[PDB]
Design a protein around this ligand. Structure first.
Ligand SMILES: CCCCCCCC/C=C/CCCCCCCC(=O)O[C@@H](COC(=O)CCCCCCCCCCCCCCC)COP(=O)([O-])OCC[N+](C)(C)C
Ligand SMILES: CCCCCCCC/C=C/CCCCCCCC(=O)O[C@@H](COC(=O)CCCCCCCCCCCCCCC)COP(=O)([O-])OCC[N+](C)(C)C
Ligand SMILES: CCCCCCCC/C=C/CCCCCCCC(=O)O[C@@H](COC(=O)CCCCCCCCCCCCCCC)COP(=O)([O-])OCC[N+](C)(C)C
Ligand SMILES: CCCCCCCC/C=C/CCCCCCCC(=O)O[C@@H](COC(=O)CCCCCCCCCCCCCCC)COP(=O)([O-])OCC[N+](C)(C)C
Ligand SMILES: CCCCCCCC/C=C\CCCCCCCC(=O)O[C@@H](COC(=O)CCCCCCCCCCCCCCC)COP(=O)([O-])OCC[N+](C)(C)C
Ligand SMILES: CCCCCCCC/C=C\CCCCCCCC(=O)O[C@@H](COC(=O)CCCCCCCCCCCCCCC)COP(=O)([O-])OCC[N+](C)(C)C
Ligand SMILES: CCCCCCCC/C=C\CCCCCCCC(=O)O[C@@H](COC(=O)CCCCCCCCCCCCCCC)COP(=O)([O-])OCC[N+](C)(C)C
Ligand SMILES: CCCCCCCC/C=C\CCCCCCCC(=O)O[C@@H](COC(=O)CCCCCCCCCCCCCCC)COP(=O)([O-])OCC[N+](C)(C)C
Ligand SMILES: CCCCCCCC/C=C\CCCCCCCC(=O)O[C@@H](COC(=O)CCCCCCCCCCCCCCC)COP(=O)([O-])OCC[N+](C)(C)C
Ligand SMILES: CCCCCCCC/C=C\CCCCCCCC(=O)O[C@@H](COC(=O)CCCCCCCCCCCCCCC)COP(=O)([O-])OCC[N+](C)(C)C
Ligand SMILES: CCCc1cc(O)c2c(c1)OC(C)(C)[C@@H]1CCC(C)=C[C@@H]21
Ligand SMILES: CCCc1cc(O)c2c(c1)OC(C)(C)[C@@H]1CCC(C)=C[C@@H]21
Ligand code: NA
Lengths: 653, 653
């Protein structure tokens, strides 16, 4: 989108159009001027020794610090890498040593609010200068820095560089394993240290990964190395300010590959046997067992990876994120255990509810038809009453409440994206409200119950099409009728409704008054009649040259002909082309959308259950893995024939 | 297209079917006849020494020059390269030295008007003969040649070989860097020298480049080498006879890659720091700043690169030419600064104008309907008058003038290509003229104002569809409704209008006169009625066997059936197939056309502004780059995540 905008830049080589010794020093450090550096430092020290001792450190720092932002000559030298930067770095460090300012000088930080908190080690590590990083780390550097500020903590991507506000995080995110090892070995580096939002190095690595495989073993390898060399089950347990762990964060942001690696991370090497989650039990060829860990990947605690992966619509990579067992096996087990039967019961109850509405609407023509009303509570009807009158009115509320909650909990910015069941949550609620209001209307006198009851019946019969997601083959349609009617038949109206309006008045103006023939006498009378006739022309009912027309018959005929040739073709057969394109696009992608909707329904029904039954319908055992650990489990026996065949073919040939 | 045609050819090995010593010499130089060369030259010199001195040079030149075209034996020898051309070249040069004709002989030029002005050095350089080129350059050659004539200066491509009419230009355009260096080092070669149209070597290189990347670093590398070794900011400032610089010429002709290279040419090496246009300020990973130069790339002077890139329709590579910052950033800044609000104001004013027209046309049925007229100037109506009567009539003129200018400035051969906003410039003007003429008609008496007013209202309501280019999603339709109606529903009529005419008279001929039944009595009466009934059959109203038919009922029924099966299908459902193909073709290419039209609108509105506001809405600062230069600037902070990630992955692995 639009380029981001920042305050004063870090290093401005090209001076804009908007004290001597400091500028001399900055220019000298910018390029290779070793002799100039020596002379400038000599004269600077001679000037410095002109006053009392206590002001020597402050004066030296002020002379070597740019008051505009707080930049130090060392940072300028590091930023402008030249084939002889090492010598100037050595000279500056020695000069700092002379006056005993090897401290603050090294650990200098910006002052401008944009790049606040930066330090020399960050710049040294960024520019690949590993040797300078080692020198600074040894001498006096402070690894536990925090590069806060807008530039290092943008509101979103494409507006800054977020890496973790820590030298170790920057080294890991810029693919510098050697610097990572050097920093980790140093005792001062505390690996677990949340910086700004709440993020240990693992979260920083997760939030800069790629959404798929291109060639990058970089992020995955760095994450694995950090987790291993850490040697503790602690990094993957911390939480950020929003309360997420690296696994949950990877699931939420949509980074599929880190999630895949971390769900099934196996450590064959002995003596760890605890940071893994895929304890393999036995394997005899194609058949392979496993003991995947469900400690935080089952909808129990509050925010299991499954719920975050299913109930989020920001990303569109979810189709590959639900075949990353134990997610797939969990969904299958729930579906075959407690979610299909509830789905069928809901279908049957809704169908009988609609049939009851219709049979108390038409079969009996709502009554004897004298001065009647529907169900209400009138007794003395027996069998048809206690079922017909009650079951509807009760069950209607049972919907109005449930969906009423859903719309209340609907998050607009995310859930309004269609294909997230909102288009049905609205219609169910509208139908229930219509039935309730239909009853309440006549309940006083209000003889208008009909319109509302008929609207409710029509909406209910139309919405009963929602339940076609239970069958795989006839499940795509329920998506098309949405995707089309909000992608090709809604943006199309804003075009059509122009022409129909345009010619709607035009034709209505050429007409001439003929009250003489006892009535209208002409097909195109008022605006409404002209619009209706144009619509019937668009669908096709008939036309003819209308008499009683003034200022021309030819103009009227020409206008009608051009409307017909401009709407019945070249518009309708263009909307149809767009509709065909949309159907083709959303017909190949049938498995993904259907499976996603089935998962959403399964999770919704699982939530609907009470705590008792849900506790009964748990999955897993109490695996004892390594000498202290009791973690949940899910024994899933996988079988892979093609993979085993290709492996054995390419192995022993 | 058709092959080009030239006059007498350069070298005619195969004599056509349409003095001795000259032919002997030409034949000897054609192939390897060293001994023949020696003998012929000896006898030629013996003959030459038969007369006085003053005629010796002229006689020698005449004997060694072909009067038909002016070709010299040296040029013939160079054209027919043989494994022993060096020896004959040496012999001819020595012989020229003997008689002191090492001048004119070397600098010989054609006489035929087609290949006029050519010289030996051109032929030597073309044939890869670098050594011969060096020899000629050393001895007496004239580098500052001009190879004029039709063959070297064709009216367009595929009719000649245009390279710059200069040995240096030919060497650079035939990928001969060594010869280029040899010529540049020679002091006589003046690099800046416009030849025929006005072209320094840079323009010649720009006008022979490729429109995209295939493998050719050739043209770009040669351009870079010439510009660098020139070492001055002068070549990119000259102008041709049409007043364009290499940057502008590259933009106009459509060569995208040279434009891309020259907009963002960065010279890292110090001591130049002035031929660049991308002074990079700082970079800390993905985030990168820049100081792109807008000295001649902003719509200020008269013909900035932006205007030439947007307001030209000859090429169709523009879609990649508007993502070559600072063009894209300039467009974004203008759009978010002063072009969106004007667009919305125009939309609102046009919408209210159309609604006023409609409400003074229908809502009031144009009046009490006794003997009325629309707005005119009749007073004593108050609120509805001062707005209804004035705003339209005034605003109409405000359109008729503006569009009236546009059509006047419309260049036919280029702008008539549709998708260049002509299809709307015509309709707006027609609508305004119709409103004005509608008023002026009745203004005397002329009770025909209706037809014109209704036409104006219909056209205005239809054209209000123009404003759908402001929204990205609903912006394609404004292009579909043009492409389809000028590419599939216009070439289709010339077919349909045959059948409807063909059967139009045929069916009208089998009818028989029945004035006996008080009136027509038969559906297919005159030609007009038959045509109308056939059209209604095509769209669908109804049909039946018409009585009162002579010479057969069977023939009439067969003709109608074959028309229905030949038009209602196999023609309409073929136009629909073509329409679907066009919609599919122009639906994928939605971003490009919409962005191009948005850019055109932005530039048009920018032009519309007065000098004051435009001066207020400038962009850039007064960058001071290298020691003398004050040039405009545009600080654009770019961010590239994927590029940085792939670079770092492939760099330190
Ligand atoms: C008698 C007359 C009155 C009758 C009244 C009865 C009703 C008559 C009804 C009439 C409407 C009929 C047409 C419906 C469709 C039109 C488009 C639309 O609705 O949304 C569009 C605008 O996108 C949005 O997100 C809109 C959100 C609106 C609601 C926001 C609620 C926020 C507060 C919280 C809620 C508070 C509680 C609210 C409930 C109390 C959707 O388009 P999109 O976003 O581009 O979709 C993405 C599609 N894609 C993913 C394929 C790309
Ligand atoms: C959501 C998508 C679908 C939309 C709906 C579907 C498409 C469109 C709708 C279709 C339904 C059928 C037609 C409409 C209903 C009839 C009444 C009506 O509306 O118009 C009435 C008046 O209005 C006009 O005459 C309109 C004049 C031209 C359009 C003006 C638009 C701006 C309105 C003004 C803005 C001012 C702003 C001022 C600013 C300074 C018609 O008068 P009538 O002839 O007496 O009525 C018929 C009576 N009869 C039949 C008994 C004889
Ligand atoms: C009551 C009866 C009378 C009514 C009268 C009222 C009007 C009635 C109207 C009737 C016409 C209705 C049909 C319109 C479309 C037909 C085709 C067409 O017009 O151009 C076609 C011919 O291509 C051209 O370029 C034609 C240019 C013509 C104008 C030249 C003006 C030159 C002088 C300067 C101007 C001087 C001032 C002029 C103004 C004063 C366009 O086809 P194309 O070129 O192949 O298009 C490329 C498409 N592509 C890029 C997708 C491939
Ligand atoms: C731009 C694209 C769209 C084009 C328009 C749409 C498609 C075509 C048009 C449709 C509109 C409706 C029909 C036309 C209008 C009616 C009048 C008419 O034109 O014909 C009249 C005469 O002409 C004929 O009878 C024509 C004979 C056959 C075609 C001859 C073509 C050459 C013309 C000659 C060249 C000579 C060259 C000589 C060289 C040596 C018909 O006579 P009529 O029956 O008395 O009229 C009806 C009267 N009534 C209804 C009151 C009874
Ligand atoms: C006869 C008809 C009468 C009514 C006419 C009503 C007309 C007025 C309606 C609305 C006023 C809107 C004003 C704000 C938007 C300005 C344009 C804009 O921002 O476009 C954006 C694209 O936009 C999209 O990509 C959106 C895609 C969906 C468009 C749906 C249009 C539906 C029309 C009905 C909607 C209303 C529904 C309710 C109607 C009652 C791009 O612009 P940007 O983001 O600013 O660009 C900066 C960033 N960028 C350069 C990187 C892109
Ligand atoms: C023998 C093998 C057994 C295997 C395991 C069996 C399953 C597990 C055990 C039991 C099933 C689940 C028990 C808890 C029910 C909680 C309420 C509930 O689910 O409400 C829901 C369903 O509506 C009902 O369930 C109606 C209430 C009674 C359900 C139990 C019937 C008796 C058990 C009969 C058991 C045998 C059944 C035999 C025939 C299949 C409400 O949904 P809704 O109102 O439609 O939602 C409206 C909004 N929406 C449409 C957008 C979603
Ligand atoms: C207004 C209307 C009134 C009537 C409404 C009647 C409605 C009731 C009709 C039938 C009840 C069926 C109950 C059992 C099936 C449950 C779902 C199921 O199993 O789906 C399976 C997919 O299914 C397919 O892939 C089938 C594809 C063809 C579907 C055709 C539907 C025709 C509808 C008419 C049919 C009846 C014809 C006769 C009608 C008189 C998948 O489920 P699974 O296999 O259990 O999943 C485990 C394995 N898996 C996860 C790996 C996949
Ligand atoms: C093939 C597809 C092409 C593309 C689509 C094209 C779509 C075109 C859309 C719309 C145009 C179609 C015609 C609409 C008007 C016809 C009725 C009329 O004119 O008058 C009638 C209504 O008169 C009124 O004043 C009430 C109008 C209420 C709105 C009715 C349309 C709502 C459509 C909402 C659609 C939402 C759909 C959402 C889901 C998609 C009655 O007036 P009358 O006739 O004089 O009768 C006398 C009775 N009276 C005295 C009581 C007045
Ligand atoms: C607070 C933040 C401000 C940000 C910057 C604001 C913008 C910059 C500042 C100012 C806007 C530009 C000023 C110069 C206008 C020159 C004339 C001109 O543009 O004519 C054009 C528009 O028509 C008009 O502009 C009508 C004349 C009055 C415009 C100014 C209104 C008062 C300022 C209100 C300011 C607040 C507005 C608030 C609501 C948006 C004529 O176009 P047309 O006739 O349609 O063209 C016909 C042909 N065509 C259709 C093929 C093209
Ligand atoms: C589905 C699509 C298929 C493909 C397309 C197929 C297209 C086919 C095209 C055309 C053929 C369609 C039929 C046209 C004629 C019908 C009227 C007639 O015959 O007579 C009438 C006109 O009589 C005249 O003499 C005036 C004719 C003026 C031209 C009218 C058509 C202009 C179409 C321009 C279209 C431009 C479109 C540009 C944008 C696209 C009246 O005669 P009558 O009936 O005897 O009534 C008695 C009245 N009278 C006494 C006053 C005479
Ligand atoms: C089948 C796909 C889901 C669905 C269900 C509906 O109830 C309706 C649907 C779509 O489309 C709209 C909103 C245009 C209908 C309006 C009126 C009625 C009678 C029903 C509405
Ligand atoms: C919507 C695309 C732009 C557009 C605008 C128009 O005004 C018209 C358009 C197209 O098509 C033609 C020229 C066939 C129409 C003729 C008659 C009328 C009433 C309008 C004409
Ligand atoms: Na098709």
């Amino acid at each position: 989108t639009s380029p981001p905008v920042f305050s004063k830049p870090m290093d401005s080589n090209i001076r804009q159009c908007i004290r001597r010794l400091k500028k001399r020093i900055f220019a000298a450090v910018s390029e290779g001027c070793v002799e100039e550096l020596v002379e400038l430092l000599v004269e600077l020290q001679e000037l410095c020794r002109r006053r009392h001792d206590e002001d020597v450190p402050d004066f030296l720092m002020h002379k070597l610090t740019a008051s505009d932002t707080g930049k130090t000559c060392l940072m300028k030298a590091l930023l402008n890498i030249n084939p002889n930067t090492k010598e100037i770095v050595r000279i500056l460090l020695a000069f700092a040593e002379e006056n005993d300012i090897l401290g603050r000088f090294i650990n200098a930080e910006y002052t401008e609010e944009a790049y606040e908190g930066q330090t020399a080690l960050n710049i040294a590590i960024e520019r690949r200068q590993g040797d300078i990083a080692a020198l600074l780390i040894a001498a006096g550097a402070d690894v536990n820095a925090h590069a806060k500020g807008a530039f290092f903590n943008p509101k979103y991507q494409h507006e800054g560089f977020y890496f973790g506000e820590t030298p170790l995080a920057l080294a890991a995110c810029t693919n510098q394993p050697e610097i990572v090892q050097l920093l980790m070995e140093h005792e001062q580096t505390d690996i677990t240290s949340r910086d700004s939002r709440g993020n240990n190095i693992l979260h920083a690595l997760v939030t800069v990964a790629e959404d798929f495989k291109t060639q990058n073993d970089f992020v995955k390898r760095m994450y694995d190395m950090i987790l291993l060399r850490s040697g503790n089950w602690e990094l993957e347990t911390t939480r950020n300010n929003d309360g997420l762990t690296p696994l949950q964060l990877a699931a939420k942001m949509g980074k599929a590959e880190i999630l895949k690696y971390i769900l099934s991370r196996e450590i064959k090497e002995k003596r760890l046997r605890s940071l893994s989650r895929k304890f393999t039990d036995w394997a005899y060829g194609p058949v392979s067992s496993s003991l995947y860990d469900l400690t935080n990947v089952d909808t129990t605690t509050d925010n299991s990876v499954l719920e975050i992966t299913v109930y989020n619509t920001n990303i569109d990579n979810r189709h590959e994120m639900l075949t990353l067992e134990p997610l797939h096996t969990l969904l299958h087990m729930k579906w075959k255990k407690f979610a299909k039967h509830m789905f069928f019961l809901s279908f049957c109850f809704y169908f009988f509810y609609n049939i009851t509405l219709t049979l108390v609407s038409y079969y009996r023509p709502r009554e004897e038809e004298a001065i009647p009303h529907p169900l209400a509570l009138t007794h003395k009807m027996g069998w048809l009453q206690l079922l017909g009158r009650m079951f509807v009115l009760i069950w209607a509320m049972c919907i109005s409440v449930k969906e009423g909650i859903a719309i209340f909990l609907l998050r607009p910015s995310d859930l309004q994206s269609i294909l997230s069941d909102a288009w049905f949550h609205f219609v169910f609620f509208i139908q229930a409200v219509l039935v309730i209001l239909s009853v309440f209307l006549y309940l006083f006198a209000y003889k208008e119950y009909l319109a509302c009851l008929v609207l409710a019946m029509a909406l209910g019969w139309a919405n009963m099409l929602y339940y076609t997601r239970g069958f795989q083959s006839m499940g795509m349609y329920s998506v098309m009728i949405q995707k089309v009617i909000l992608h090709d038949v809604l943006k199309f109206l804003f075009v059509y409704i122009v022409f129909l309006l345009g010619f709607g008045v035009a034709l209505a103006s050429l007409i001439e008054k003929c009250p003489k023939d006892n009535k209208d006498c002409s097909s195109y009378g008022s605006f409404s009649d002209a619009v209706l006739e144009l619509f019937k022309l668009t669908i096709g009912l008939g036309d003819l040259n209308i008499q009683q027309n003034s200022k021309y018959p030819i103009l009227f005929l020409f206008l009608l002909i051009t409307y017909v040739i401009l709407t019945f073709v070249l518009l309708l057969n263009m909307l149809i082309a767009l509709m065909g394109e949309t159907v083709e696009n959303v017909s190949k992608e049938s498995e993904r959308i259907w499976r996603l909707q089935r998962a959403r329904t399964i999770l919704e029904f699982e939530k609907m259950l009470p705590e008792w039954l849900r506790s009964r319908f748990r999955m897993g055992e109490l695996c004892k893995v390594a000498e202290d650990d009791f973690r949940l489990c899910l024994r899933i026996n996988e079988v892979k024939w093609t993979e085993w065949k290709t492996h054995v073919s390419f192995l022993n040939e």
